[PDB]
């Protein structure tokens, strides 16, 4: 399996309700392992998976120190951007930062990411070369010139290709029982088909990990129904993921159609058909 | 592990 580590930062200004709300979460693949919320009592980075609890007091002091320096950067940024965009002090505004690294099944570097948004839109993004910037508009071009002059891309390259991949590798080892698990989806079939000529068949997938899955509906051959009705993959809340896909068929031709479930943890691709 | 470099103001 390929793997990723990602950190997600949100700050929201709230004039006359004091300092920006700041929330940080870390992920390994689809498992959250840390967070910081400026409104909680701890004022600390806190564990959110059992395998990060192995880390000693220096980890938690360090990540607390660093997450607050990130928070302080966003506070300044919210002020700066109100200036760049000529905005009042009245409104709530959002800054977002995402960064991290992907590795392949050999756990070697594939790709690095460092991206910033303002009010839900792209502001500045590190390109795949880990030295070029995409600036969304005139304001982001000011930021671009400042971050070029200071060699921000060179600093990020050192973390993205080095630090990020080896701490990802450390987490994948220490959390081996969670993170390298592959829970195959428990599947089944529902027939909710209360039309005269037409039946609708939903093909279910519960308790799987990771969240990556494919729910093809097939017919006689072809393989395709561009008319499938699949809900966004959702958290079960226990650390596993749920999904289904739906196709509308004739009430006669019940058992001419096949659900093709694909998951990393299934030896062979499953293949389900309406059983009375 | 968080970045400890490459975090500057916009």
């Amino acid at each position: 399996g390929s793997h990723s580590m990602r950190y997600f930062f949100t700050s929201v200004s709230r004039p006359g309700r004091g300092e920006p709300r700041f929330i940080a979460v870390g992920y390994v693949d689809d498992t959250q392992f840390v967070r910081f919320d400026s409104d909680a009592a701890s004022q600390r980075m806190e564990p959110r998976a059992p395998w990060i609890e192995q880390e000693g007091p220096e980890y938690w002091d360090g990540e607390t120190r660093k997450v607050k320096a990130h928070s302080q950067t966003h506070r300044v940024d919210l002020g700066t951007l109100r200036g760049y965009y000529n905005q009042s002090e009245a409104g709530s505004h959002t800054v977002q930062r995402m960064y991290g690294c992907d590795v392949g099944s050999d756990w070697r570097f594939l790709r690095g990411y460092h991206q910033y948004a303002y009010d839900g839109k792209d502001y500045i993004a590190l390109k795949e070369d880990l030295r070029s910037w995409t600036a969304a508009d005139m304001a982001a071009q000011t930021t671009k010139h400042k971050w070029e002059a200071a060699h921000v891309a060179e600093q990020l390259r050192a973390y993205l290709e080095g630090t990020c991949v080896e701490w990802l590798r450390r987490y994948l080892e220490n959390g081996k029982e969670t993170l390298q698990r592959t829970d195959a989806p428990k599947t089944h079939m529902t027939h909710h088909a209360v039309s005269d000529h037409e039946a609708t068949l939903r093909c279910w997938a519960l308790s799987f990990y990771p969240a990556e899955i494919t729910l093809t509906w097939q017919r006689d051959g072809e393989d395709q129904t561009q008319d499938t009705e699949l809900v966004e993959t959702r958290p079960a809340g226990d650390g596993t993921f749920q999904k289904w896909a739906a196709v509308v068929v004739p009430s006669g031709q019940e058992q001419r159609y096949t659900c093709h479930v694909q998951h990393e943890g299934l030896p062979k691709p499953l293949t389900l058909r309406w059983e009375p | 592990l968080l970045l400890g470099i490459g975090i500057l103001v916009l």
Partner: T-cell receptor
Amino acid sequence: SQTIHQWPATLVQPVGSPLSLECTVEGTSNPNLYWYRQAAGRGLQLLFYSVGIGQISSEVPQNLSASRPQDRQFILSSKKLLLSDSGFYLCAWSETGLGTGELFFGEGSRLTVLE
Amino acid sequence: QEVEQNSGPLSVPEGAIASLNCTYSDRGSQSFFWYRQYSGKSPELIMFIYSNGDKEDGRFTAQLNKASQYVSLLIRDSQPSDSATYLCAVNVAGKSTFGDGTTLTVKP
């Protein structure tokens, strides 16, 4: 342009006296501010770290205290100095956030406490 | 110990290359510093490095190896005025951790 001044430069004080060291930076805003001490050798113990105005992180249980009443104003104090508070006290700033992490030091405050 | 450098004093003849070394134990460290400190004075940055390999700036070359966990400083063509305490530092845990210094005397 960018500037860090600390005061006083040298102090000789009796055990039990109060301490006030001041540090001032010009030509930057929202800096990280640090108090380090050099005692019983070279190399630097972090005493206080401040990520921003009003925010003081104490890095060792100690007889000293720090405050940052404005952006560019960092203060180190004690009500009752001990013999063991003797040292070279260094104020430093770094750019807002986590850049290269280069520290700009003040010219330092040399404190001798005498019985 | 987090940042280890020999105390010296390290004696080097005028015109020879001084070799300063530093090891760090925390693999979370993401940049690396040499500061110079004259007796009585405050530390002053010689250079920083955050990429594996060598970085040259005139007479000074920093070397970083994140696999071995070592930072070196080489001073070409050493002068008596380079006599100082050289402080190795590591940016880890959102702050600079300092070594206890290497004292260098360049004999004229």
